[PDB]
Structure 1
């Protein structure tokens, strides 16, 4: 499913992402935008290390979910990577919350640093009623 901007903003708010571990809703929106373009079925293979990024937040198979074909992988979210490709994003959200419980926080995603950090992210939630 490809979410429309405000639809996703309201969904994330209902799932308790606003201010989770100090991260504002607009930061989560900026992250989803640049990682997958709000596409839940987005997948990207990293030929360089044999890992794959899955879902709306592009969580990596080496650390977060299990796909069985990634060498030396852990499964911190305790989920099959298939769960991150559903139209219902509850599991992808539960996993993203797990990612930020680690010291790096939102910085765990390189794209957040390049595209969202130190910027005016208000645009991502403006007019959505959240």
Structure 2
């Protein structure tokens, strides 16, 4: 499923993402935008280390979900990567919360540093009623 901007903002708010571990909703929106374009079935294989990023938040198979074919894999979020390709983002949100519980926080995603950090991100939630 490809979410509409405001539709996604309200969904993540309802799921308790606003201010989770000090991370504003505008920042989670900025992250989803640049990681998958708000697309739940987005997947990206990393030829270099043989891991795959899954879903709307591009969650990695080496640390957060299990896909069976990733070398030196662990299951921190303890989920099958399959769950992160669903139209319902509840599991992807629970996994994203797990990622930010580590000291790095939102910085875990390099894309967040390049396109969101230290920027005016209000544009991601403006007009959405959140």
Do both share a fold (TM > 0.5)?
Answer: yes
What secondary structure does 1:53 align onto?
Answer: strand
Can you list the C-alpha shifts for 1:79-118, whole angstroms capped at 9, x where unaligned?
A: 0000000000000000000000000000000000000000
Whole-Å Cα distance in 2 between the matches of residues 127 and 106 of structure 1? 24
Tell me the CA shift for residue 40 of structure 1: 0.1
RMSD of equivalent CA atoms: 0.3
What secondary structure does 2:117 align onto?
Answer: coil
What secondary structure does 2:66 align onto?
Answer: coil
Whole-Å Cα distance in 1 between the matches of residues 101 and 78 of structure 2? 15
**Equivalent residue, structure 2, for 1:13:** 13
Whole-Å Cα distance in 2 between the matches of residues 124 and 27 of structure 1? 8
Whole-Å Cα distance in 1 between the matches of residues 105 and 93 of structure 2? 14
Tell me the CA shift for residue 18 of structure 1: 0.2
Tell me the CA shift for residue 74 of structure 1: 0.3
Tell me the CA shift for residue 78 of structure 1: 0.5
For structure 2, the 5+ residue unaligned runs are none
Flag as ranges the 4+ runs of structure 1 deviating above 6 A.
none
Can you list the C-alpha shifts for 1:28-66, whole angstroms capped at 9, x where unaligned?
A: 000000000000000000000100000000000000000
Aligned length: 130
For structure 1, the 5+ residue unaligned runs are none
Tell me the TM-score normalised to structure 1 length. 1.00
